[PDB]
Amino acid sequence: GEETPLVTARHMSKWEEIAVKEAKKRYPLAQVLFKQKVWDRKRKDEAVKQYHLTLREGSKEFGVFVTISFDPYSQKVNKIAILEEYQ
């Protein structure tokens, strides 16, 4: 199925799923049908790897961004938040 653009290219990230789980659950009128990466980095003693998915609601599709603050030491997720695109 066209579940993501990976016709031969399965290579998911650590948080590429935690992001999805929140990105369906916070969107009760909608469905999430994508998984794309963005920027990422680390700091001394935090790290960030957000993602961009595509939600679908009614007949609109729209992206949302999943804030995940984690730790570089052992991937303790320090916190999570959610952010909506608007147009």
Coordinates of all heavy atoms in Angstrom, one line a residue:
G1 N 0.8 -1.2 0.0 CA 0.0 0.0 0.0 C 0.9 1.2 0.0 O 2.0 1.2 0.5
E2 N 0.4 2.4 -0.5 CA 1.1 3.6 -0.4 C 0.8 4.2 1.0 O 0.0 5.1 1.2 CB 0.6 4.6 -1.5 CG 0.9 4.2 -2.9 CD 0.7 5.4 -3.8 OE1 -0.4 5.6 -4.2 OE2 1.8 6.1 -4.1
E3 N 1.5 3.6 2.0 CA 1.4 4.0 3.4 C 2.4 5.0 3.7 O 2.2 5.9 4.6 CB 1.5 2.7 4.2 CG 0.4 1.8 3.9 CD 0.3 0.7 5.0 OE1 -0.3 0.9 6.1 OE2 1.0 -0.4 4.8
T4 N 3.6 5.0 3.0 CA 4.6 6.1 3.0 C 5.4 5.9 1.7 O 5.3 4.9 1.1 CB 5.5 6.0 4.3 OG1 5.5 4.8 5.0 CG2 5.1 7.1 5.3
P5 N 6.2 6.9 1.3 CA 7.0 6.9 0.1 C 8.2 6.0 0.3 O 9.3 6.6 0.7 CB 7.3 8.3 -0.3 CG 7.4 9.0 1.1 CD 6.2 8.3 1.9
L6 N 8.1 4.7 0.3 CA 9.2 3.8 0.5 C 9.0 2.5 -0.2 O 9.1 1.4 0.4 CB 9.4 3.6 2.0 CG 8.2 3.7 2.9 CD1 7.2 2.5 2.7 CD2 8.6 3.7 4.4
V7 N 8.8 2.6 -1.5 CA 8.6 1.4 -2.4 C 9.7 0.3 -2.3 O 9.5 -0.8 -2.8 CB 8.5 2.0 -3.8 CG1 9.9 2.4 -4.4 CG2 7.8 1.1 -4.8
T8 N 10.9 0.6 -1.7 CA 12.0 -0.3 -1.5 C 12.9 0.2 -0.4 O 14.1 -0.2 -0.3 CB 12.7 -0.4 -2.9 OG1 13.7 -1.4 -2.9 CG2 13.4 0.9 -3.4
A9 N 12.4 1.1 0.5 CA 13.3 2.0 1.3 C 12.9 2.1 2.8 O 13.1 3.2 3.3 CB 13.3 3.3 0.5
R10 N 12.4 1.1 3.4 CA 12.2 1.0 4.8 C 13.4 1.3 5.6 O 14.4 0.6 5.5 CB 11.7 -0.4 5.2 CG 12.5 -1.6 4.6 CD 12.7 -2.7 5.6 NE 13.7 -3.7 5.1 CZ 13.6 -5.0 4.8 NH1 12.5 -5.6 5.2 NH2 14.5 -5.6 4.2
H11 N 13.4 2.5 6.3 CA 14.5 2.9 7.1 C 13.9 4.0 8.0 O 13.9 5.2 7.7 CB 15.6 3.5 6.3 CG 16.7 4.3 7.1 ND1 17.0 5.6 6.9 CD2 17.3 3.8 8.2 CE1 17.8 5.9 7.9 NE2 18.1 4.8 8.7
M12 N 13.2 3.6 9.1 CA 12.5 4.4 10.1 C 13.5 4.9 11.1 O 14.5 4.2 11.4 CB 11.4 3.5 10.7 CG 10.3 4.2 11.3 SD 9.0 3.1 11.8 CE 7.7 4.4 12.0
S13 N 13.2 5.9 11.8 CA 14.0 6.5 12.9 C 13.4 6.1 14.3 O 12.4 5.5 14.4 CB 13.9 8.1 12.8 OG 15.1 8.6 13.3
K14 N 14.2 6.5 15.3 CA 13.9 6.2 16.7 C 12.5 6.7 17.1 O 11.7 6.0 17.7 CB 14.9 6.8 17.7 CG 14.7 6.7 19.2 CD 15.0 5.3 19.8 CE 14.6 5.3 21.3 NZ 15.3 4.3 22.1
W15 N 12.2 8.0 16.8 CA 11.0 8.7 17.3 C 10.0 8.8 16.1 O 9.0 9.4 16.3 CB 11.4 10.0 17.9 CG 12.5 10.0 18.9 CD1 13.8 10.2 18.7 CD2 12.4 9.7 20.3 NE1 14.6 10.1 19.9 CE2 13.7 9.7 20.9 CE3 11.3 9.4 21.2 CZ2 13.9 9.5 22.3 CZ3 11.6 9.1 22.5 CH2 12.9 9.1 23.1
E16 N 10.3 8.3 14.9 CA 9.4 8.3 13.7 C 8.1 7.6 13.9 O 7.3 7.5 13.0 CB 10.2 7.6 12.5 CG 10.6 8.6 11.4 CD 11.1 7.9 10.2 OE1 10.2 7.3 9.4 OE2 12.3 7.9 9.9
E17 N 7.8 7.0 15.1 CA 6.7 6.3 15.5 C 6.0 6.9 16.7 O 4.7 7.1 16.6 CB 7.0 4.8 15.8 CG 8.4 4.7 16.4 CD 8.4 3.4 17.3 OE1 7.8 3.5 18.4 OE2 8.9 2.4 16.8
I18 N 6.7 7.3 17.8 CA 6.2 8.1 18.9 C 5.5 9.4 18.3 O 4.3 9.7 18.7 CB 7.3 8.4 19.9 CG1 7.8 7.1 20.5 CG2 6.9 9.4 21.0 CD1 9.2 6.6 20.0
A19 N 6.1 10.0 17.3 CA 5.5 11.1 16.6 C 4.1 10.7 16.0 O 3.2 11.5 16.1 CB 6.5 11.6 15.6
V20 N 4.1 9.6 15.3 CA 2.9 9.1 14.6 C 1.8 8.9 15.6 O 0.6 9.3 15.4 CB 3.1 7.8 13.9 CG1 1.9 7.5 13.0 CG2 4.4 7.9 13.0
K21 N 2.1 8.2 16.7 CA 1.1 7.8 17.7 C 0.4 9.0 18.2 O -0.9 9.1 18.2 CB 1.8 7.0 18.8 CG 2.1 5.6 18.2 CD 3.1 4.8 19.1 CE 4.5 4.6 18.4 NZ 5.1 3.3 18.7
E22 N 1.1 10.1 18.6 CA 0.5 11.3 19.0 C -0.2 12.0 17.8 O -1.3 12.4 18.0 CB 1.7 12.2 19.6 CG 2.2 11.8 20.9 CD 1.2 12.2 22.1 OE1 1.2 13.4 22.4 OE2 0.5 11.3 22.6
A23 N 0.4 12.0 16.7 CA -0.2 12.7 15.5 C -1.4 12.0 15.0 O -2.2 12.6 14.2 CB 0.9 12.7 14.4
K24 N -1.8 10.7 15.3 CA -3.2 10.3 15.1 C -4.1 10.6 16.3 O -5.2 10.9 16.1 CB -3.3 8.8 14.7 CG -3.0 7.7 15.8 CD -3.9 6.5 15.6 CE -3.4 5.6 14.5 NZ -4.0 4.2 14.6
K25 N -3.5 10.6 17.5 CA -4.4 10.5 18.7 C -5.0 11.8 19.0 O -6.1 12.0 19.3 CB -3.7 9.8 19.9 CG -2.7 10.7 20.7 CD -3.4 11.5 21.8 CE -2.5 11.7 23.0 NZ -3.2 12.2 24.2
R26 N -4.2 12.9 18.8 CA -4.6 14.3 19.0 C -5.5 14.8 17.9 O -5.9 16.0 17.9 CB -3.3 15.1 19.2 CG -3.6 16.5 19.6 CD -2.6 17.0 20.7 NE -2.8 18.4 21.0 CZ -2.0 19.1 21.9 NH1 -1.0 18.4 22.6 NH2 -2.2 20.4 22.1
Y27 N -5.9 14.0 16.9 CA -6.6 14.4 15.7 C -7.7 13.5 15.4 O -7.7 12.7 14.6 CB -5.5 14.4 14.6 CG -4.5 15.5 14.7 CD1 -3.3 15.3 15.4 CD2 -4.8 16.8 14.3 CE1 -2.4 16.4 15.7 CE2 -4.0 17.9 14.6 CZ -2.8 17.7 15.3 OH -2.0 18.7 15.7
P28 N -8.8 13.7 16.3 CA -9.9 12.7 16.3 C -10.8 12.8 15.2 O -11.6 11.9 14.9 CB -10.6 13.0 17.7 CG -10.3 14.5 17.9 CD -9.0 14.8 17.2
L29 N -10.9 13.9 14.4 CA -11.7 14.0 13.2 C -10.9 13.5 12.0 O -11.5 13.3 10.9 CB -12.1 15.5 12.9 CG -13.3 15.9 13.8 CD1 -12.9 16.0 15.3 CD2 -13.9 17.2 13.3
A30 N -9.6 13.2 12.2 CA -8.7 13.0 11.1 C -7.9 11.6 11.1 O -8.2 10.8 12.0 CB -7.7 14.2 11.1
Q31 N -7.1 11.4 10.1 CA -6.2 10.2 10.0 C -4.9 10.6 9.6 O -4.8 11.6 8.8 CB -6.8 9.3 8.9 CG -8.3 8.9 9.1 CD -9.2 9.5 7.9 OE1 -10.0 8.8 7.4 NE2 -9.0 10.7 7.6
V32 N -3.8 10.0 10.1 CA -2.4 10.4 9.7 C -1.9 9.3 8.7 O -2.0 8.1 8.9 CB -1.5 10.5 11.0 CG1 -1.1 9.2 11.6 CG2 -0.2 11.3 10.6
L33 N -1.4 9.8 7.5 CA -1.0 8.9 6.4 C 0.4 9.0 5.9 O 0.7 8.5 4.8 CB -2.0 9.0 5.2 CG -3.3 9.9 5.4 CD1 -3.8 10.3 4.0 CD2 -4.4 9.3 6.1
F34 N 1.3 9.8 6.6 CA 2.6 10.0 6.1 C 3.6 9.9 7.3 O 3.2 9.8 8.4 CB 2.7 11.4 5.5 CG 3.1 11.4 4.1 CD1 2.1 11.3 3.1 CD2 4.5 11.6 3.7 CE1 2.5 11.4 1.7 CE2 4.8 11.7 2.3 CZ 3.8 11.6 1.3
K35 N 4.9 9.8 7.0 CA 6.0 9.9 7.9 C 7.2 10.5 7.2 O 7.8 9.8 6.3 CB 6.4 8.5 8.6 CG 5.3 7.6 9.1 CD 5.8 6.3 9.7 CE 4.8 5.2 9.5 NZ 3.5 5.4 10.2
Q36 N 7.5 11.8 7.4 CA 8.7 12.4 6.8 C 9.6 13.0 7.9 O 9.0 13.4 9.0 CB 8.3 13.5 5.8 CG 7.8 13.1 4.5 CD 8.6 13.4 3.3 OE1 8.8 14.6 3.0 NE2 9.2 12.5 2.6
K37 N 10.9 13.0 7.8 CA 11.8 13.6 8.7 C 11.9 15.1 8.3 O 11.3 15.6 7.4 CB 13.2 13.0 8.7 CG 13.1 11.5 9.2 CD 14.4 11.0 9.8 CE 15.6 11.0 8.9 NZ 15.6 9.8 8.0
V38 N 12.6 15.8 9.2 CA 12.9 17.2 9.1 C 14.4 17.4 9.5 O 15.2 16.5 9.5 CB 11.9 18.1 9.9 CG1 10.5 18.0 9.4 CG2 11.8 17.7 11.4
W39 N 14.8 18.6 9.9 CA 16.0 18.9 10.7 C 16.1 18.0 11.9 O 15.1 17.4 12.4 CB 15.9 20.3 11.1 CG 16.9 20.9 12.0 CD1 18.1 21.5 11.6 CD2 16.8 21.2 13.5 NE1 18.6 22.2 12.7 CE2 17.9 22.1 13.8 CE3 15.8 20.9 14.4 CZ2 17.9 22.7 15.1 CZ3 15.9 21.4 15.7 CH2 16.9 22.3 16.1
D40 N 17.3 17.8 12.5 CA 17.5 17.4 13.9 C 18.8 17.8 14.4 O 19.7 18.2 13.6 CB 17.3 15.9 14.0 CG 18.5 15.0 13.8 OD1 19.5 14.9 14.6 OD2 18.4 14.2 12.8
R41 N 19.1 17.7 15.7 CA 20.3 18.0 16.3 C 20.5 17.3 17.7 O 19.6 16.6 18.1 CB 20.5 19.5 16.5 CG 19.6 20.2 17.4 CD 20.3 21.5 18.0 NE 19.4 22.3 18.8 CZ 19.2 23.6 18.7 NH1 19.7 24.3 17.7 NH2 18.5 24.3 19.6
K42 N 21.5 17.6 18.4 CA 21.5 17.5 19.9 C 22.1 18.8 20.5 O 22.6 19.7 19.8 CB 22.0 16.2 20.4 CG 23.5 15.9 20.1 CD 23.8 15.1 18.8 CE 24.4 15.9 17.7 NZ 24.6 15.1 16.5
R43 N 22.0 18.9 21.8 CA 22.6 19.9 22.7 C 23.6 19.2 23.6 O 24.0 18.1 23.3 CB 21.4 20.6 23.4 CG 20.4 21.3 22.5 CD 20.6 22.9 22.4 NE 19.9 23.5 23.5 CZ 19.5 24.8 23.5 NH1 19.9 25.7 22.6 NH2 18.6 25.2 24.5
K44 N 24.0 19.8 24.7 CA 24.8 19.1 25.7 C 23.9 18.0 26.3 O 24.4 16.8 26.3 CB 25.1 20.1 26.9 CG 26.5 20.8 26.7 CD 26.6 21.7 25.5 CE 27.8 22.6 25.5 NZ 27.7 23.8 26.4
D45 N 22.7 18.3 26.8 CA 21.9 17.4 27.7 C 20.4 17.6 27.4 O 19.6 17.5 28.2 CB 22.3 17.7 29.1 CG 22.4 19.1 29.6 OD1 22.0 20.1 28.8 OD2 22.9 19.4 30.7
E46 N 20.1 17.8 26.1 CA 18.9 17.6 25.4 C 19.2 17.3 24.0 O 20.3 17.5 23.5 CB 17.9 18.7 25.6 CG 16.4 18.3 25.5 CD 15.4 19.5 25.8 OE1 15.3 19.9 26.9 OE2 14.8 19.9 24.8
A47 N 18.2 16.8 23.2 CA 18.2 16.5 21.8 C 16.8 16.6 21.2 O 15.8 16.5 22.0 CB 18.8 15.1 21.6
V48 N 16.7 16.9 19.9 CA 15.4 17.1 19.3 C 15.5 16.4 17.9 O 16.4 16.7 17.1 CB 15.0 18.6 19.2 CG1 14.6 19.1 20.6 CG2 16.2 19.5 18.6
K49 N 14.5 15.6 17.5 CA 14.3 15.0 16.2 C 12.8 15.1 16.1 O 12.1 14.2 16.6 CB 14.8 13.5 16.1 CG 16.3 13.3 16.1 CD 16.7 11.8 16.4 CE 16.2 10.8 15.5 NZ 16.7 10.9 14.1
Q50 N 12.3 16.2 15.6 CA 10.8 16.2 15.2 C 10.6 15.5 13.9 O 11.6 15.0 13.3 CB 10.4 17.7 15.1 CG 10.7 18.5 16.4 CD 11.9 19.4 16.3 OE1 12.9 19.1 15.5 NE2 12.0 20.5 17.0
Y51 N 9.4 15.4 13.4 CA 9.0 14.9 12.1 C 7.8 15.7 11.6 O 7.2 16.5 12.4 CB 8.5 13.4 12.3 CG 9.5 12.6 13.0 CD1 9.5 12.6 14.4 CD2 10.6 12.0 12.2 CE1 10.6 12.0 15.1 CE2 11.7 11.5 12.9 CZ 11.7 11.5 14.3 OH 12.8 11.1 15.0
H52 N 7.5 15.5 10.3 CA 6.3 16.1 9.7 C 5.5 14.9 9.1 O 6.1 14.1 8.4 CB 6.7 17.1 8.7 CG 5.6 18.1 8.3 ND1 4.7 18.6 9.2 CD2 5.4 18.6 7.1 CE1 4.0 19.6 8.5 NE2 4.4 19.6 7.2
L53 N 4.2 14.8 9.5 CA 3.3 13.8 8.9 C 2.3 14.5 8.0 O 2.4 15.8 7.9 CB 2.6 13.0 10.0 CG 3.4 12.5 11.2 CD1 4.7 11.7 10.9 CD2 3.8 13.5 12.3
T54 N 1.3 13.8 7.4 CA 0.2 14.4 6.8 C -1.1 13.8 7.4 O -1.3 12.6 7.4 CB 0.2 14.1 5.3 OG1 1.5 14.4 4.7 CG2 -0.8 14.9 4.5
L55 N -1.8 14.7 8.1 CA -3.2 14.3 8.5 C -4.2 14.5 7.3 O -3.9 15.3 6.4 CB -3.7 15.2 9.7 CG -3.4 14.8 11.1 CD1 -4.0 13.4 11.4 CD2 -1.9 14.8 11.5
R56 N -5.3 13.9 7.4 CA -6.4 14.0 6.4 C -7.7 14.2 7.2 O -8.0 13.3 8.1 CB -6.5 12.8 5.6 CG -7.6 12.7 4.6 CD -7.4 11.6 3.6 NE -8.6 11.2 2.9 CZ -9.4 10.1 3.2 NH1 -9.3 9.6 4.4 NH2 -10.2 9.6 2.3
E57 N -8.5 15.2 7.0 CA -9.8 15.5 7.7 C -10.8 15.9 6.7 O -10.7 17.0 6.1 CB -9.5 16.6 8.7 CG -10.6 16.9 9.6 CD -10.3 18.0 10.6 OE1 -9.7 17.8 11.7 OE2 -10.5 19.2 10.3
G58 N -11.8 15.1 6.4 CA -12.9 15.4 5.6 C -12.6 15.1 4.1 O -12.9 14.1 3.6
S59 N -11.9 16.1 3.6 CA -11.2 16.0 2.3 C -9.9 17.0 2.3 O -9.3 17.0 1.2 CB -12.1 16.2 1.1 OG -12.9 17.4 1.2
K60 N -9.6 17.7 3.3 CA -8.4 18.4 3.5 C -7.3 17.4 3.9 O -7.6 16.5 4.6 CB -8.5 19.6 4.5 CG -7.2 20.3 4.7 CD -7.3 21.8 5.0 CE -8.1 22.1 6.3 NZ -7.9 23.5 6.8
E61 N -6.1 17.7 3.4 CA -4.9 17.2 4.0 C -4.0 18.3 4.5 O -4.0 19.4 3.9 CB -4.1 16.2 3.1 CG -4.6 14.8 3.3 CD -4.7 13.9 2.0 OE1 -3.7 13.3 1.6 OE2 -5.8 13.9 1.4
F62 N -3.3 18.1 5.6 CA -2.5 19.2 6.3 C -1.4 18.5 7.1 O -1.6 17.4 7.6 CB -3.4 20.1 7.2 CG -4.1 19.3 8.3 CD1 -3.7 19.4 9.6 CD2 -5.3 18.6 8.0 CE1 -4.4 18.7 10.6 CE2 -6.0 17.9 9.0 CZ -5.5 17.9 10.3
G63 N -0.3 19.2 7.2 CA 0.8 18.7 8.0 C 0.7 19.2 9.5 O 0.2 20.3 9.7
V64 N 1.2 18.4 10.4 CA 1.5 18.8 11.8 C 2.9 18.4 12.2 O 3.5 17.5 11.6 CB 0.4 18.2 12.7 CG1 -1.0 18.6 12.2 CG2 0.5 16.7 13.0
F65 N 3.5 19.1 13.2 CA 4.9 18.9 13.6 C 4.9 18.4 15.1 O 4.2 19.0 15.9 CB 5.7 20.2 13.5 CG 5.9 20.7 12.1 CD1 5.0 21.6 11.5 CD2 7.0 20.2 11.3 CE1 5.2 22.1 10.2 CE2 7.2 20.7 10.0 CZ 6.3 21.7 9.5
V66 N 5.6 17.4 15.3 CA 5.6 16.7 16.6 C 6.9 17.0 17.4 O 8.0 16.5 17.0 CB 5.3 15.2 16.5 CG1 5.1 14.6 17.9 CG2 4.1 14.9 15.6
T67 N 6.8 17.9 18.3 CA 7.9 18.3 19.2 C 8.2 17.1 20.1 O 7.3 16.6 20.8 CB 7.4 19.5 20.1 OG1 6.8 20.5 19.3 CG2 8.6 20.2 20.8
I68 N 9.4 16.6 20.1 CA 9.9 15.6 21.0 C 11.3 16.1 21.5 O 12.2 16.3 20.6 CB 10.0 14.2 20.3 CG1 8.6 13.7 19.8 CG2 10.6 13.1 21.2 CD1 8.6 12.4 19.0
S69 N 11.4 16.4 22.8 CA 12.6 16.7 23.4 C 13.0 15.4 24.1 O 12.3 14.9 24.9 CB 12.4 17.8 24.5 OG 12.4 19.1 23.9
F70 N 14.2 14.9 23.7 CA 14.7 13.7 24.3 C 16.1 14.0 24.8 O 16.6 15.1 24.7 CB 14.6 12.5 23.3 CG 15.6 12.6 22.1 CD1 16.8 11.8 22.2 CD2 15.3 13.4 21.0 CE1 17.6 11.8 21.1 CE2 16.2 13.4 19.9 CZ 17.4 12.6 19.9
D71 N 16.8 12.9 25.3 CA 18.1 13.1 25.9 C 19.1 12.4 25.0 O 18.9 11.3 24.5 CB 18.2 12.5 27.3 CG 18.9 13.4 28.2 OD1 18.2 14.3 28.8 OD2 20.1 13.2 28.4
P72 N 20.3 13.0 24.8 CA 21.3 12.3 24.0 C 22.0 11.1 24.7 O 22.5 10.2 24.0 CB 22.4 13.4 23.7 CG 22.3 14.4 24.8 CD 20.8 14.3 25.2
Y73 N 21.9 11.0 26.0 CA 22.6 10.0 26.8 C 22.0 8.6 26.4 O 22.8 7.7 26.1 CB 22.5 10.3 28.3 CG 23.4 11.4 28.8 CD1 23.2 12.7 28.4 CD2 24.4 11.0 29.7 CE1 24.0 13.7 29.0 CE2 25.2 12.0 30.3 CZ 24.9 13.4 30.0 OH 25.6 14.4 30.6
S74 N 20.7 8.4 26.6 CA 20.0 7.1 26.6 C 18.6 7.2 26.0 O 17.8 6.3 26.2 CB 20.0 6.6 28.0 OG 20.1 5.2 28.0
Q75 N 18.2 8.3 25.3 CA 16.9 8.5 24.7 C 15.8 8.5 25.8 O 14.7 8.0 25.6 CB 16.7 7.6 23.5 CG 17.2 8.1 22.2 CD 18.7 8.0 22.0 OE1 19.1 7.0 21.4 NE2 19.5 8.9 22.4
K76 N 16.1 9.1 27.0 CA 14.9 9.4 27.9 C 14.2 10.6 27.1 O 14.8 11.6 26.8 CB 15.4 9.9 29.3 CG 15.5 8.7 30.3 CD 16.5 7.6 29.9 CE 16.5 6.5 31.0 NZ 17.4 5.4 30.7
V77 N 12.9 10.4 26.8 CA 12.1 11.5 26.3 C 11.8 12.4 27.4 O 11.1 12.0 28.4 CB 10.9 11.0 25.5 CG1 10.2 9.8 26.1 CG2 9.9 12.1 25.1
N78 N 12.4 13.6 27.4 CA 12.3 14.6 28.4 C 10.8 15.1 28.3 O 10.1 15.1 29.3 CB 13.3 15.7 28.2 CG 14.7 15.3 28.7 OD1 14.8 15.0 29.9 ND2 15.6 15.1 27.8
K79 N 10.3 15.5 27.1 CA 8.9 15.9 26.9 C 8.5 15.7 25.5 O 9.3 15.5 24.6 CB 8.8 17.4 27.3 CG 7.9 17.6 28.5 CD 7.6 19.1 28.7 CE 6.8 19.4 29.9 NZ 6.2 20.7 30.0
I80 N 7.2 15.9 25.2 CA 6.6 15.9 23.9 C 5.6 17.1 23.8 O 5.1 17.4 24.9 CB 5.9 14.5 23.6 CG1 6.9 13.4 23.7 CG2 5.2 14.5 22.2 CD1 6.3 12.0 23.4
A81 N 5.4 17.7 22.7 CA 4.3 18.6 22.4 C 3.9 18.4 20.9 O 4.5 17.7 20.1 CB 4.7 20.1 22.7
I82 N 2.8 19.1 20.5 CA 2.2 19.0 19.1 C 2.0 20.4 18.6 O 1.7 21.3 19.4 CB 1.0 18.1 19.2 CG1 1.3 16.6 19.6 CG2 0.2 18.0 17.8 CD1 2.0 15.7 18.6
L83 N 2.1 20.6 17.3 CA 2.0 21.9 16.6 C 1.3 21.6 15.3 O 1.6 20.6 14.6 CB 3.5 22.3 16.3 CG 3.8 23.7 15.9 CD1 3.3 24.1 14.5 CD2 3.3 24.8 16.9
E84 N 0.4 22.5 14.9 CA -0.5 22.4 13.7 C 0.0 23.4 12.7 O 0.3 24.6 13.0 CB -1.9 22.6 14.1 CG -2.9 21.6 13.4 CD -4.4 22.0 13.5 OE1 -4.8 22.6 14.6 OE2 -5.2 21.6 12.6
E85 N 0.1 23.0 11.4 CA 0.2 23.9 10.3 C -1.2 24.6 10.0 O -2.2 24.0 10.3 CB 0.7 23.1 9.0 CG 1.1 24.0 7.8 CD 2.2 25.0 8.1 OE1 3.4 24.5 8.0 OE2 1.9 26.1 8.4
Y86 N -1.2 25.8 9.4 CA -2.4 26.5 9.1 C -2.1 27.4 7.9 O -1.0 27.9 7.7 CB -2.8 27.4 10.3 CG -1.8 28.3 10.8 CD1 -1.7 29.7 10.4 CD2 -0.8 27.9 11.7 CE1 -0.7 30.5 10.7 CE2 0.3 28.7 12.1 CZ 0.4 30.0 11.6 OH 1.4 30.8 11.9
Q87 N -3.1 27.5 7.0 CA -3.0 28.1 5.7 C -4.4 28.6 5.4 O -4.5 29.8 5.1 CB -2.6 27.1 4.6 CG -3.2 25.7 4.7 CD -2.3 24.5 4.3 OE1 -2.6 23.6 3.5 NE2 -1.1 24.5 4.8

